[PDB]
Amino acid sequence: DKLALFLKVFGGEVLTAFARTSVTTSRHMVRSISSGKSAQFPVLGRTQAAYLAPGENLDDKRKDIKHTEKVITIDGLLTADVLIYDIEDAMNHYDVRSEYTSQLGESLAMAADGAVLAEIAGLCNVEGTATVIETTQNKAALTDQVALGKEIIAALTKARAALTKNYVPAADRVFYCDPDSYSAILAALMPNAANYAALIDPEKGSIRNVMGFEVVEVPHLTAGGAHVFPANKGEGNVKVAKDNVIGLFMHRSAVGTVKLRDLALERARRANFQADQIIAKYAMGHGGLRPEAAGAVVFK
């Protein structure tokens, strides 16, 4: 019986473990939908024209808009698991449990990221509205630090710019950068010394607001090979892949997804050549959902 309760404790440790490894939890959508193997959303758009008189009828006005609806759904399953070999599994476990929990937990998000990531750039890569931006001619020439904050930021101006005219508010948004170029390398941003209180990071792993959006990041970007994010391909009509690419721009409510049954862990004994096995599962995943606009930056 007790060996059964222990599992509940492990599950609590996990879910809680998905955070702090949390990359993107907020800053995009999600829903509790039960038994729906799929789910959908609106598209439409913001636009307006002249107005009614007691004469005629409103009906005609809606011709051009081409209202649109869009649906996505779960794909395969999503998880790894771990094969314990524990007597200790019952007890003594303060160190061991932590180790085990981390190893799946961070992994789950580490899959989760790219699935919600690269496909955005894809949405920018078909021919979202469109966007891109750069500085002069290469990263070859431009190397040295503090310039590496400069050209970037200088781009960020235009970043805030095209955030308009397609509308959407600036109220909240975030850019997921790459940890190398990360922070502007904080120099150009902060040629100040001892104040990160001034840069407002009350934990949460987040640099406070810059002009436009907000700047955080996790390592790199990849998932979908483990879609199309041709880091290898320079152009081939599609430039928004990695190599090049840049720390990212996210535009309010461009994505999210549906998860059914939340997270469930299954515990087993598979005895072929064995110790013992546990199983946790997640059914959701996605790329998708018809963003309004978006973009990235490259060097060329």
With beta carbons less than 8 A apart as the criterion, state whether 169 and 252 touch.
yes
- Per the listing, tokens 């913001």 go with 46
Could you say whether residue 264 binds its own copies (CB under 8 A)?
Answer: no
182's tokens: 């990360």
d(CA 184, CA 149): 4
CB closer to its own copies out of 137 and 164: 164
Total residues at the site for its own copies (CB under 8 A)?
91
Q: Is residue 300 involved in binding its own copies (CB under 8 A)?
A: no
- Which lies closer to its own copies via its Cβ, residue 34 or residue 237? 34
Type of residue found at 141: A
Shortest Å, Cβ 5 to its own copies: 21
The separation between the first and the last C-alpha atoms of the chain, rounded to the nearest angstrom, is 64
134 is a contact residue toward its own copies (CB under 8 A): no
- Per CB under 8 A, does 2 bind its own copies? no
Of 285, 288, 291, 295, the residue at the interface with its own copies (CB under 8 A) is 285
Please spell the DSSP secondary structure of 162-231, one letter per residue.
HTSSS---SSS--EEE-TTTGGGGTTTT---SS-STTTT--STT-B---SSS-EEE-S----S------S
Nearest to 180 by CA among 152, 213, 138, 200: 152
Kindly identify the residues of this chain, within the stretch 196-225, that bind its own copies according to CB under 8 A: 196-197, 209-211, 219, 223-224
Span 227-256, contacts to its own copies by CB under 8 A: none
Q: Which stretch binds its own copies (CB under 8 A): 121-129, 131-139, 190-198, 238-246?
A: 190-198
Residue of the chain from 23, 78, 152, 174 that contacts its own copies (CB under 8 A): 78
Dump the DSSP string for 143-173. Answer: -STTTTTHHHHHHHHHHHHHTSSS---SSS-
* Near its own copies by CB under 8 A: residue from 167, 201, 261, 262: 167
- Specify whether the backbone of 180 is left (phi greater than 0), alpha (psi in -120 to 50) or beta: alpha
Query: Is the preceding peptide bond at 232 cis, omega within 30 degrees of 0?
Result: no
| Binding of residue 80 to its own copies (CB under 8 A) | yes
Which one of 5-13, 106-114, 131-139, 243-251 is the stretch in contact with its own copies (CB under 8 A)?
A: 106-114
Of residues 1, 64, 127, 144, which one binds its own copies by CB under 8 A? Answer: 64
Q: What is the distance between the alpha carbons of residues 147 and 187, in angstroms, rounded to a whole number? A: 9
Span from 4-12, 186-194, 242-250, 287-295 in contact with its own copies (CB under 8 A): 186-194
Report, in Å, the least distance between residue 59 CB and its own copies: 8
Q: Which residues pair with 257 in a beta bridge?
A: 30
Q: Binding to its own copies by residue 35, rule CB under 8 A? A: yes
Is residue 85 within the footprint of its own copies (CB under 8 A)? yes
Least distance between its own copies and beta carbon 285 (Å): 7
Stretch that binds its own copies, among 3-11, 96-104, 129-137, 240-248 (CB under 8 A): 96-104
